Every structure is written in structure tokens, then in C-alpha cells.
């Protein structure tokens, strides 16, 4: 395609895999499974599913912090995710399991103005590349965002070629870095 007779239209497509060493890269495999790779050899896997892995209502973050045993980058990503949830006020909605240093978070997504809505809003920004196929509408709906799936499960995993549906991108995580603690409610006089 020539414009003005002398200017030819040409296109680019950036390879963001090369950014793996310095930044978290997020992508989508299919409707339910999405991933955030932290370099190679490690990352998080976010699944919207009807099968729960945690049947209890504990999130022993203090014991996990005392023992360490976890990858600090993955816990940083989890902290950014949770602090990016707006108007989170149901502590039983979120349960965890950090035994042995692993990461295994479960948000109970069980219509407008609810905890599941905020969790899905943060989920689709953490995986902005291809999350729209997972949500019921994918557009024209922010506050009443919803998914038929009942649980959002975030688990540490290993690096594989997951990025089938959307290319890797750090844009979702880097965008959510500014959203931390902006819509959290106060639970104490002294935070």
C-alpha cells in the first residue's frame, strides 16, 4: 500500500519474550487457563474453574512470611494482585495454602457490586492480553463483570510454551502496579 506515491505502509510485531529476564510476562492459553511467567523456570497459573482445591478458610500469610521458602517475585505478584482488588471486604472469599513454600490462592467467586466482580476485574487486567474470552460479555460491562466459573485459583508452576491464544506481555502487570492500595477499604484506625 503506497500513500502519496512514495510512502509504503509497513508493520511491526514486537517479540516480548525477550523481556522475560527483567519483567513478568502474562498470556492466555485458552478460556480457563492463563499464565504469568517470571523469567523462565517459574510463574503463576490462573485458572477459572468450578473445582475447588482448598476446602478451608485460612490464609496463613504470617507463617509463610516467617518461614520464607517461597519465590519473592511470585509473592510480590500475589500481593500486587490482592492489593489491586477494589473494595475487597470478605476475607472468607480468599483462602490460601503456602505449606512448603508453594503458592496456592483460591478466590471464591460465588450480581452487581460483589467481591467476585472485583476479583474478575483485577484478573482481566493481570492477564489483559487474552482474558476477554474468559468473561461472559468481554466488553460494555465493568462494574457488573461476571463469569460462570465459581473459583479463581492462582498456583505456582513451571515454564512451558503456554501462550497459545495471546502473546506474552508485561503490560497488564505494569499497569496494575499503579492500582495497588487505591481501592482498599480501611479495616483499622491505624493501618
Amino acid at each position: 500500500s503506497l500513500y502519496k506515491g512514495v510512502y509504503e505502509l509497513q508493520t511491526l510485531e514486537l517479540n516480548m519474550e525477550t523481556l522475560n529476564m527483567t519483567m513478568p510476562l502474562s498470556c492466555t492459553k485458552n478460556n480457563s487457563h492463563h499464565y504469568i511467567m517470571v523469567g523462565n523456570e517459574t510463574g503463576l497459573e490462573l485458572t477459572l474453574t468450578n473445582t475447588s482445591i482448598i476446602n478451608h478458610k485460612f490464609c496463613n500469610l504470617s507463617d509463610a512470611h516467617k518461614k520464607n521458602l517461597y519465590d519473592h517475585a511470585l509473592m510480590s505478584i500475589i500481593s500486587t494482585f490482592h492489593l489491586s482488588i477494589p473494595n475487597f471486604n470478605q476475607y472468607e472469599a480468599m483462602s490460601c495454602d503456602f505449606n512448603g513454600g508453594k503458592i496456592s490462592v483460591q478466590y471464591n467467586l460465588s450480581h452487581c457490586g460483589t467481591v467476585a466482580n472485583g476479583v474478575l476485574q483485577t484478573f482481566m487486567r493481570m492477564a489483559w492480553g487474552g482474558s476477554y474470552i474468559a468473561l461472559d460479555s468481554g466488553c460494555g460491562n465493568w462494574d457488573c463483570i461476571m463469569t460462570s466459573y465459581q473459583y479463581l485459583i492462582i498456583q505456582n508452576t513451571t515454564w512451558e510454551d503456554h501462550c497459545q491464544f495471546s502473546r506474552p506481555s508485561p503490560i497488564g502487570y505494569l499497569g496494575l502496579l499503579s492500582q495497588r492500595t487505591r481501592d482498599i477499604y480501611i479495616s483499622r484506625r491505624l493501618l
Binding site: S1, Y3, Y7, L9, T11, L12, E13, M16, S76, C139
Partner: protein, 154 residues
């Protein structure tokens, strides 16, 4: 505040101030260099996704080159340095356009004009998407015409 990170690529060039994306920074493409006239616009304008990506790639290159790598990867460096590289509110605009069913940039594909004989190019602008489909080059043909009209004046 506002981005400040400056691109540094001048060795072996006919003039300083340009920037070159290597084969590793591109999907199924070879080395591509943009002159000083286009890259220098990245120092001022606040609404170009491509300039943010150039600063990200340059920061990644410098960080891998100059800083000692840890045993296990840590994301503290980018978590501190992100606001100096990119405009996060540009990402916010693109996401707002996405939820509003407006075409938006996903930061993957960009387009530029290229003069056939001289080889001079405009700053690449992002190719927008809407529900997984790229725009079809007729949805923004007037933008391409205006961009072509901007280079003839230079």
C-alpha cells in the same frame, strides 16, 4: 511523574539519535532502524505506545548488560523503575477503550510509513484491535494519509 528514560543507540550510525530493533525484539522480522527524527519525538509525546515499548526494551537490554544477575530472578528492579520507562495511564486509556468496545492498542502490532527511495520512516503507531480482530487498514486510512502528509512537510 513523567517518563525520563533516554534511548542510547548511536554506534556505527550515519547520525546519532536513532534506535534499532534487532531480530530478537521482533516477530518474524529482521533488524529495523528508525532515524533520529522519529525516535526523538519519543522524548516529548505522552501518548505513543511504541515509545514506551522502546524504553522498555532499552531498559531490559541495559539491565541485563550492566547489573549483576541474581541466583533467582527478582522483579524489584522493574517494580521500582516502571514509571520512568512508560506512561501507565496510556495502558489505562487502552484498557478503558477495551472495556468500552472502542478499538484499542494491545501493544503488539505497530505500523509506520517508509519512503521507498530515501528509507526515512515515521514513528510507528499502534495497530488497534477490537475483540481479537485487528483493524483492516481501511478503518484508519485517513490517519495513514495524515501521517504521510506530515512527512512531506519535513
Amino acid at each position: 511523574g513523567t517518563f525520563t528514560w533516554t534511548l542510547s543507540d548511536s554506534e556505527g550510525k550515519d547520525t546519532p539519535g536513532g534506535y534499532c530493533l534487532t531480530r530478537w525484539m521482533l516477530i518474524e522480522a529482521e533488524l529495523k532502524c528508525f532515524g533520529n527524527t522519529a525516535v526523538a519525538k519519543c522524548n516529548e509525546k505522552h501518548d505513543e505506545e511504541f515509545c514506551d515499548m522502546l524504553r522498555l526494551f532499552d531498559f531490559n537490554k541495559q539491565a541485563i548488560q550492566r547489573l549483576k544477575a541474581p541466583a533467582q530472578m527478582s522483579i524489584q528492579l522493574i517494580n521500582k523503575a516502571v514509571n520512568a520507562l512508560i506512561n501507565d495511564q496510556l495502558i489505562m486509556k487502552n484498557h478503558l477503550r477495551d472495556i468500552m468496545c472502542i478499538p484499542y492498542c494491545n501493544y503488539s502490532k505497530y505500523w509506520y510509513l517508509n519512503h521507498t527511495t530515501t528509507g526515512r520512516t515515521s514513528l510507528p503507531k499502534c495497530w488497534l484491535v477490537s475483540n481479537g480482530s485487528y483493524l483492516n487498514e481501511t478503518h484508519f486510512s485517513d490517519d495513514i494519509e495524515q501521517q504521510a502528509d506530515n512527512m512531506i512537510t519535513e
